[PDB]
Amino acid sequence: STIVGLHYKIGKKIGEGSFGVLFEGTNMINGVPVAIKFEPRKTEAPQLRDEYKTYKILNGTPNIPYAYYFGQEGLHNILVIDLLGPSLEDLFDWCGRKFSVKTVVQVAVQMITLIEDLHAHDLIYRDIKPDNFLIGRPGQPDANNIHLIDFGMAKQYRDPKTKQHIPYREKKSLSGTARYMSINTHLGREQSRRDDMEALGHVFFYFLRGHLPWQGLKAPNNKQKYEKIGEKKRSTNVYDLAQGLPVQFGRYLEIVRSLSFEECPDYEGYRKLLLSVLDDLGETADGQYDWMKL
Structure with missing residues (x-):
């Protein structure tokens, strides 16, 4: 021992x-x-x-x-x-790499809240992915609550004392995972709170669809692959991502893509937008998730 x-x-x-x-x-x-x-x-x-x-x-x-x-x-x-328990990527895999709308809505609102709390501590996450969001342990009050780990990429976006936002800049080398990264990250722009919110929107569509249209692209080098993925993201209308899915997820991504560099996300507005999906479907946020049927 x-x-x-x-x-x-x-x-x-x-x-x-x-x-x-x-x-x-x-x-x-x-x-x-x-x-x-x-x-x-x-x-x-x-x-x-x-x-x-x-x-x-x-x-x-x-x-x-x-x-x-x-x-x-x-x-x-x-x-x-x-x-903690399994990651959302583990649960996703066990659930056949697609989540129901009700599961995604409930998980989404909690992920927004985690990131809001991180942002409240003056930090941006910069490596949003389902692999780093985990559920709790069985029978705990937070057994099916989403949790956030892995702060290796986290960085200060404002001074903790004054709240002075970091300066804007471009020409940055690509940081984070290509699949979920924001369009502005692809263009070498300094990351801020908006970029975490957009990456969340990409993860939500990944859960709902099982894959994103910029997976499986071919390029000579990684830099060119990054470039191609970014172009596809820029080209892809948000409602192509949302086809057969609630339009609120398309609208979510449209909104966070339009945030300015220093802008504070409307976290509560995003939660209400996504919860309205359940009202549309006659469903309720009652804590039943796809993995609880496994």
Whole structure:
């Protein structure tokens, strides 16, 4: 039995990669389950200590896991946070890579709220994807609540004291995942709150459709592939994305695409827009999700 940070016992390995290794485990002083990430101390780019700092800023935010411990032991940097459940990408896969409208509406409104809370802590996320939004653990009050992890790409968009927005600029190298990234990110524009909101809109359509029309494109190099995906996004009318689906999802994406660089998103307006879908369909936001039928 291997222990880190004085009282965190390591259990089964749950992930591995260039970042390091990820285990589940137990906080032995109180029995709460935790996730423990280990990053090699001598690594090209260290993210773990910075991620901890981001977690401390967030610590206390609803549905973001608490960070219990960061330290350096043996040959690794170590981070301990609350253990959560499957990601939306895991659940998506188990559900045959398509979610019902009712599931997407309910998940969407919670994702908007998570990002609103992140933005309230002066941070933009910059790497929106279904792989980083997770449900809770069975039988907990937040078992089917959406949670947000992985703050490796997060960056300050305004000064925490003054709230002075970062400056506009262009010619930026492409950061984030090509599938969900905003049109403005494709054009090398400085990212702000709008870009997180647009990426959310792309994820919503991905859930509803099973795929986006800019997946599976061919290019000579990655830079050219990025360019082609961006053009397709620019070309694709929002109502081609929404065909057979509630028009509110097309409208959502249209609205967030028109936000100005410094503009505060209308989070509550977006939640009401998306919830109105349920009124249209005679459905209700009662906490029933597709994965609860598995």
